[PDB]
């Protein structure tokens, strides 16, 4: 009765993984999975330049990774939806309970 | 408001996180946890359904074993393999649901 995922839906999911295997991508979203945040507050909390948080965070929007609202003078940024923030956590406990 | 108190994971830990990612970022690796994910399977099991040998079918499985992703246990005259915990259950079904909205 069991049938593994389609192939095409196994290469989806792969290059998923592969875009979040980046340091520098998962220490933005290590601050994103605990509070929406500005551009200048990730740049301070990363230590380098509001125009290089600009940038990544770029990427990060294309790939549906993050999202933004605005809230009068200022652009937040959060993590996309909740399954981010869950596979975020799970991964870090299992990485830590082995 | 609490933007103060937070401080970004150590680089130590990124990097960590960011070779676990790299593991999974393998189609057979995902076709093959989408079946434990559902049960706990013989090596005979896993090879009907991804129609290859059961000789690279457990190649595969050593892999995994080593990088702490599936275990196994025998009950008599056959070894059953299974995930190694529930979190790599759920940031699977996490990264899927994900996927399609």
């Known amino acids: 009765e069991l049938q593994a995922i389609a192939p095409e839906v196994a290469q989806s ?6 875009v979040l295997a980046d340091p520098n991508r998962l220490r933005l979203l290590s601050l994103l999975a605990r509070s929406e945040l500005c551009v200048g507050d990730l740049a301070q909390a990363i230590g380098v330049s509001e125009s290089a948080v600009s ?4 990427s990060l929007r294309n790939l549906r990774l993050v999202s933004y609202r605005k809230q009068g003078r200022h652009v937040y940024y959060q993590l996309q939806d909740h399954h981010i923030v869950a ?3 799970n991964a870090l406990d299992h990485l830590q309970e082995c």
């Open 87 to 89: 596979l975020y956590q």
């Open 55 to 58: 940038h990544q965070l770029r």
């Open 13 to 18: 999911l792969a290059e998923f993984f592969a």
